[PDB]
């Protein structure tokens, strides 16, 4: 299943749902009266997360679902100094 | 045993109620309960402590709430401190003991 | 809970949680050795139930987690190390926390058993990696992030 | 084992294909998740056209280059053909 | 009627207050909003209605024993509310239900 | 218990316990994937409570303990690995049991988590060391030891 | 606190009592009408275990007490080829 | 961390001592075990006398030569001087 993530730039960020449920609030956003049980779009809009940070959090979703159990080498996540501050705030907001 | 102690304490609750007022019934009941915490500590398994005490409560102080709740009015409205303490310890263990006494005290 | 809110501090900076998970906590020579022992799972669980400071940092820098991942007798009492590790982790102990020497509890393990038992409890989060990348290159995060994140960055 | 970032004008899809897989099945995946016919979906790779016959093993999507921490990106354009319409996200300096 | 639309409403509002329960409530007495919405139900709705609910619940089951057919969903829903309202209690989750229903 | 005493055997010799701890046991594409996910701690515990042959050996040679320790997800669901390991060990499992390819369960681990989790349960015994020493140098143990030791030497 | 394990040849292998109770039967042989709660002899008469293998059993007791909780690449127990198959049934009798 | 097998004619005592310890501690131990005062017993090492003064660290009881899996034997003679008459262990059977 695929869910959409909308930034403040309008960038849709379609991500497989099982990877996108690692963050707590995206699980919470799709819960309650935001389920929309028709399986047509299944989108959540972030009014205060820029696109250059949703890209990083989606890359982290894929990275974490890939390396959740492979405790072999666990390669480091590449975080630029420019992206470092807003990425922390986004992970805090999403409980990522 | 729980069936046997239930009958014995129902009989004892009916016997104490036939010769004592509420100012003396509660002291005798708390005397029985304090002894019952000993008459079951030196005889029974440690798992049976809570069952015997709870069963003798709901045979002697929870089968006579009508006697205790009705007499709670005269106990509270005259500041019988020795009697009020005994009623509170008695009525706390009962499931629906306090929610009336509380009200009475508030009034 | 009242005493924990009073927040005692040992001369080493150990809070109540550190002494309940330590193995160097002194026990008197009398019969207390027959009953009292440290680390003890029940005592740590009770302290965490009363809202103890799970991320308390002593003078050296060791967190509540750093003291028991250093425990030197894992196999003998694996129950009372597993229970305390999972209790600390479920109580919010940041498993990536660094002391003044920047040593995570994985680094300060000195034991395969405790290291891997912590690794099984290390839910990797983007927040931890982002905080580590923020603090690694000295990015000014003062008042530019949530106040609940300034201490979080200070953990790393 | 090879991770891709499908890039439309603004849409982006994070897919996970195998080491050596055909372009047809990922094209079908994109069709299924956007509900569009395949005749207007042509996959790019750094301003290089692709057709529905090659595979990711020889296209350059090496598993040592498309690591999920920084997945290799591809482009799409949609025809009612269109060229690359990739828009950079943003970059606010510290 | 006011429990089926409220038990789900309590869980839905727990999701809405996800950041509050995670970053504020757990660190700092206080209860999670999912738990709080239920402890404001077993202290303001059920406990004042201990006499009315139980004496009506036992009357409905007694009518079933007599031969009548009460609303199974309503009776089972109210009875299940005594144990669902304390689902957040770690020690003895069936303590409210036992003392309010099983004993009488 | 009735089915366990029937002692089923898959074509690969997998007993009822082997399948419950194997992650290679297939689950059909319907909603059973949402619930019936293997290995399951509750299924293995229920099988062991019903007197399952914990030391059962397939035609390959793997016991109920060699099969689990090859689990490829030792961290995300570490609870249902640790629970099955302790349930096996505390009931009847021989931690040092040697399969047909001279492999200890520690040897067939391919995972630090499972290896050291099993090592925390390995009660060392002089009987096992003596059995290993007898098997390694090929002493003719026929009729010179109790019969229960002969199959015990065959275990190692 | 020093149990005296006699052997088939009279070799009294006096060992620490806590060390010897790592074996089931020595724990059982001192349990019951063999306690002798006087800390005078507390002797055990193995009338079926040779001295040369009871000595190895005692080295095993000390080795196990020392390296129980360590598991830090414990040294391999030296069992001679000729004394094995005697140590095997000795450890079968003296369980663990 | 030194392990010793103090040998009588037949009686053997399994003792453990620290890496920095002297002969007097072992004399006190064997007094506490054999009920023999130390003024009539003297320890030994591969059939040569040892003095009450020097420590076991330099006496040859190094940690890598008296490991618990193979402790080093120590003689013991009691005054009734009497020479060391330690009886060896039983002869292991030949390989079948």
């Amino acid at each position: 299943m695929y869910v959409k993530l909308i930034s403040s730039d309008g960038h849709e960020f379609i991500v497989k749902r099982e990877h996108a449920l690692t963050s707590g609030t995206i699980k919470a956003m799709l819960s309650g009266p935001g389920q929309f049980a028709e399986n047509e779009t299944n989108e959540v809009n972030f009014r205060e997360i820029p696109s250059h940070v949703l890209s990083k959090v989606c890359m982290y979703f894929t990275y974490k679902v890939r390396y959740t159990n492979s405790s072999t080498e666990i390669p480091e996540f590449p975080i630029a100094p420019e992206i470092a501050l807003e990425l922390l705030m986004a992970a805090n907001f999403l409980d990522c | 045993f729980l069936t046997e102690t239930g009958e014995y304490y129902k009989q004892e609750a009916s016997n104490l109620l036939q010769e004592s007022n509420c100012s003396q019934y509660m002291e005798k009941v708390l005397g029985r309960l304090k002894d019952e915490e000993i008459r079951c500590r030196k005889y029974l398994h440690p798992s049976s402590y809570t069952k015997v005490i709870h069963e003798c409560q709901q045979r002697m102080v929870a089968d006579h709430l009508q006697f205790l709740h009705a007499e709670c009015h005269n106990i509270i409205r005259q500041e019988k401190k020795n009697d009020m303490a005994n009623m509170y310890v008695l009525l706390r263990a009962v499931s629906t003991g306090l929610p009336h006494m509380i009200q009475e005290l508030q009034n | 809970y009242n005493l924990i809110h009073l927040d005692p501090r040992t001369r080493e900076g150990f809070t109540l949680l550190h002494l309940a998970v330590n193995s160097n906590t002194p026990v008197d020579d009398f019969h207390t050795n027959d009953v009292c022992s440290f680390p003890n799972a029940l005592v740590t669980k009770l302290l965490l139930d009363c809202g103890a400071e799970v991320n308390a940092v002593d003078n050296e820098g060791n967190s509540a987690l750093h003291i028991i991942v250093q425990y030197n007798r894992p196999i003998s009492d694996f129950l009372t190390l597993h229970s305390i590790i999972i209790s600390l982790v479920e109580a919010g102990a940041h498993t990536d926390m660094t002391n003044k020497q920047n040593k995570t509890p994985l680094d300060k393990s000195t034991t395969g058993v405790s290291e891997i038992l912590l690794k099984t409890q290390m839910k990797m989060s983007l927040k931890c990696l982002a905080a580590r990348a923020v603090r690694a290159n000295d990015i000014n995060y003062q008042d530019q992030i949530p106040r609940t994140l300034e201490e979080f960055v200070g953990f790393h | 084992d090879v991770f891709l970032m499908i890039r439309r004008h603004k849409t982006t899809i994070f897919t996970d294909a195998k080491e050596s897989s055909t372009v047809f099945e990922l094209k079908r995946i994109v069709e299924g998740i956007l509900k569009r016919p395949p005749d207007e979906q042509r996959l790019y790779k750094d301003d290089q056209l692709l057709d529905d016959g090659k595979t990711l093993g020889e296209c350059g999507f090496t598993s040592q280059t498309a690591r999920p921490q920084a997945p290799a990106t591809v482009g799409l354009a949609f025809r009612a053909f269109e060229a690359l319409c990739i828009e950079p996200f943003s970059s606010p300096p510290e | 009627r006011y429990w089926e639309e409220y038990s789900k409403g309590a869980d839905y509002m727990d999701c809405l207050y996800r950041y509050l329960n995670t970053q504020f409530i757990k660190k700092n007495p206080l209860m999670e909003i999912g738990e709080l919405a239920l402890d404001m139900w077993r202290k303001l709705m059920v406990e004042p209605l201990q006499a009315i609910l139980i004496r009506m619940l036992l009357r409905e089951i007694k009518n079933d024993r007599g031969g009548e057919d009460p609303n199974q969903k309503v009776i089972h829903g109210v009875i299940n509310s005594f144990v669902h309202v304390e689902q957040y209690k770690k020690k003895f989750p069936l303590k409210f239900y036992q003392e309010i229903f099983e004993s009488p």
Side-chain angles (χ1 to χ4, degrees), chain A, chain B, chain C, chain D, chain E:
Chain A
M1 189 59 72
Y2 282 46
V3 307
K4 289 207 294 188
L5 307 178
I6 296 90
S7 75
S8 73
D9 295 324
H11 275 81
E12 274 85 9
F13 264 99
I14 308 173
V15 160
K16 310 170 56 160
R17 179 161 173 171
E18 198 39 65
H19 306 346
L21 288 191
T22 64
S23 68
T25 72
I26 294 188
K27 176 184 293 188
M29 279 189 190
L30 304 158
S31 162
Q35 180 58 256
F36 264 52
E38 71 260 8
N39 288 314
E40 264 172 33
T41 67
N42 210 13
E43 82 273 30
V44 296
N45 45 356
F46 302 146
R47 260 85 182 281
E48 44 184 340
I49 296 170
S51 47
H52 62 99
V53 177
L54 276 179
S55 69
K56 292 306 290 186
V57 309
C58 294
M59 288 182 212
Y60 172 75
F61 289 156
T62 308
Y63 167 94
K64 193 243 191 176
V65 74
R66 160 73 158 99
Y67 299 113
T68 177
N69 281 311
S70 162
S71 73
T72 73
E73 205 271 331
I74 184 69
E76 282 321 296
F77 205 64
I79 288 172
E82 181 255 357
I83 204 54
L85 265 176
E86 194 74 22
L87 193 47
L88 167 82
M89 285 189 268
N92 184 66
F93 170 53
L94 300 169
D95 276 334
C96 190
Chain B
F1 183 49
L2 292 196
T3 304
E4 173 69 34
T5 191
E7 297 175 3
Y8 178 72
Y9 281 160
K10 179 182 317 161
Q11 178 54 43
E12 271 305 313
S14 293
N15 268 38
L16 290 186
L17 207 42
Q18 278 181 357
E19 62 97 24
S20 296
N21 46 355
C22 194
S23 164
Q24 288 158 237
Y25 171 73
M26 302 184 301
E27 274 77 358
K28 280 168 185 171
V29 163
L30 283 162
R32 304 293 272 162
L33 264 67
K34 176 182 297 314
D35 271 320
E36 193 55 41
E37 299 158 76
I38 297 161
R39 291 175 304 209
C40 83
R41 193 162 327 273
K42 70 195 178 87
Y43 282 143
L44 279 78
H45 194 266
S47 77
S48 287
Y49 293 169
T50 176
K51 262 182 268 186
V52 172
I53 297 159
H54 166 265
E55 197 279 331
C56 68
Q57 280 163 2
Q58 297 175 350
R59 208 63 44 196
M60 196 189 290
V61 74
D63 267 357
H64 296 284
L65 282 171
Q66 169 54 48
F67 178 74
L68 262 69
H69 274 180
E71 281 262 21
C72 185
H73 182 99
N74 203 8
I75 288 300
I76 287 177
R77 309 279 289 248
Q78 265 154 32
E79 307 290 325
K80 287 194 174 67
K81 288 169 70 169
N82 61 6
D83 271 309
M84 207 178 304
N86 288 319
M87 182 171 296
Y88 164 69
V89 184
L90 276 194
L91 287 198
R92 175 168 67 198
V94 179
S95 168
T96 182
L98 289 177
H100 173 253
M101 166 172 195
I102 288 156
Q103 188 67 33
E104 272 297 326
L105 176 61
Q106 159 184 317
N107 276 280
Chain C
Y1 171 86
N2 304 141
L3 184 47
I4 278 169
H5 263 279
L6 271 183
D7 200 85
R9 274 300 165 92
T10 301
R11 81 168 77 242
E12 206 59 40
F14 291 148
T15 193
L16 205 46
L17 199 50
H18 293 112
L19 299 178
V21 309
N22 203 4
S23 88
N24 316 318
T25 293
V27 186
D28 60 80
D29 45 355
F30 212 62
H31 282 133
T32 58
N33 300 119
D34 304 336
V35 186
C36 301
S37 287
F38 289 104
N40 189 358
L42 296 99
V43 185
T44 308
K45 201 262 193 186
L46 211 47
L47 291 189
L48 289 174
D49 186 74
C50 303
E53 190 85 9
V54 70
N55 302 318
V57 167
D58 74 319
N59 303 108
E60 170 62 34
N62 302 3
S63 170
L65 203 50
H66 287 98
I67 308 290
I68 197 161
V69 291
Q70 284 163 219
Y71 185 67
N72 61 338
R73 295 176 64 252
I75 296 90
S76 72
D77 60 354
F78 185 80
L79 305 187
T80 199
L81 198 151
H82 189 56
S83 290
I84 303 193
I85 280 290
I86 68 172
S87 283
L88 275 178
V89 163
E90 85 177 6
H94 195 68
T95 58
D96 192 74
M97 209 183 316
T98 74
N99 53 354
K100 265 156 185 52
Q101 300 179 2
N102 282 312
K103 295 190 86 70
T104 63
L106 280 197
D107 287 333
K108 264 193 162 168
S109 183
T110 76
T111 291
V113 178
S114 295
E115 177 172 2
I116 294 171
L117 184 62
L118 178 57
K119 274 171 74 167
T120 58
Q121 301 287 324
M122 275 183 64
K123 316 284 191 296
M124 52 182 314
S125 66
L126 169 60
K127 201 195 292 186
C128 316
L129 318 176
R132 196 187 300 125
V134 158
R135 202 179 166 90
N137 51 10
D138 292 327
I139 288 175
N140 202 46
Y141 60 93
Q142 302 294 332
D143 290 337
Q144 313 212 38
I145 53 162
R147 184 167 284 106
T148 56
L149 284 194
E150 283 164 33
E151 55 204 10
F152 182 88
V153 174
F155 285 169
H156 305 74
Chain D
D1 199 53
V2 166
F3 304 90
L4 281 78
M5 273 186 53
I6 316 293
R7 294 287 314 268
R8 258 289 306 267
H9 294 79
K10 284 173 158 331
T11 313
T12 302
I13 295 95
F14 283 66
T15 45
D16 164 37
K18 291 315 159 206
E19 287 105 352
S20 50
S21 58
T22 181
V23 194
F24 174 67
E25 66 181 1
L26 56 88
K27 198 158 148 60
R28 282 307 292 165
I29 284 162
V30 171
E31 290 157 61
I33 64 190
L34 266 72
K35 319 290 188 294
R36 286 290 289 273
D39 45 347
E40 76 264 16
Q41 313 175 7
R42 289 198 303 170
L43 185 137
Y44 299 88
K45 175 51 194 323
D46 288 329
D47 201 30
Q48 156 179 19
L49 268 296
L50 276 77
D51 298 322
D52 206 64
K54 276 75 70 177
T55 192
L56 314 187
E58 51 87 26
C59 188
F61 300 130
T62 308
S63 76
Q64 281 81 37
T65 313
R67 208 61 77 182
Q69 53 205 14
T73 184
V74 308
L76 293 180
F78 272 42
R79 171 196 55 92
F81 209 80
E82 296 296 327
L84 282 76
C85 46
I86 306 312
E87 300 172 353
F89 314 115
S90 181
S91 181
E94 180 256 334
Chain E
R1 151 189 314 151
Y2 287 154
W3 168 248
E4 299 270 52
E5 87 174 12
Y6 181 89
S7 86
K8 294 169 68 169
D11 286 347
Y12 284 1
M13 204 177 53
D14 188 18
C15 305
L16 181 48
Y17 286 74
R18 163 68 58 100
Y19 194 86
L20 195 83
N21 308 299
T22 295
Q23 297 299 115
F24 165 70
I25 290 293
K26 204 49 69 201
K27 292 176 170 56
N28 311 101
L30 309 189
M31 294 173 286
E32 311 196 302
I33 309 293
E35 167 177 354
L36 171 71
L38 301 185
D39 271 333
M40 294 282 145
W41 176 270
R42 72 139 295 183
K43 296 182 198 302
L44 265 66
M45 176 92 170
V46 183
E47 270 205 324
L49 279 175
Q50 282 204 356
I52 301 189
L53 279 181
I54 292 311
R55 101 196 176 198
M56 275 187 183
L57 268 182
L58 312 178
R59 196 59 206 261
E60 287 292 340
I61 308 186
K62 197 173 86 65
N63 280 346
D64 185 273
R65 282 158 173 165
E68 282 91 350
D69 201 3
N71 193 290
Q72 168 213 337
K73 185 185 173 182
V74 162
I75 302 305
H76 173 45
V78 175
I79 286 162
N80 209 34
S81 76
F82 298 142
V83 70
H84 188 273
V85 69
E86 274 209 347
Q87 76 161 19
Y88 279 93
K89 258 77 172 181
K90 43 195 74 63
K91 268 83 72 172
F92 316 121
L94 283 80
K95 173 71 56 206
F96 191 50
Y97 163 80
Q98 273 169 32
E99 87 166 5
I100 199 175
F101 193 56
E102 280 196 10
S103 285

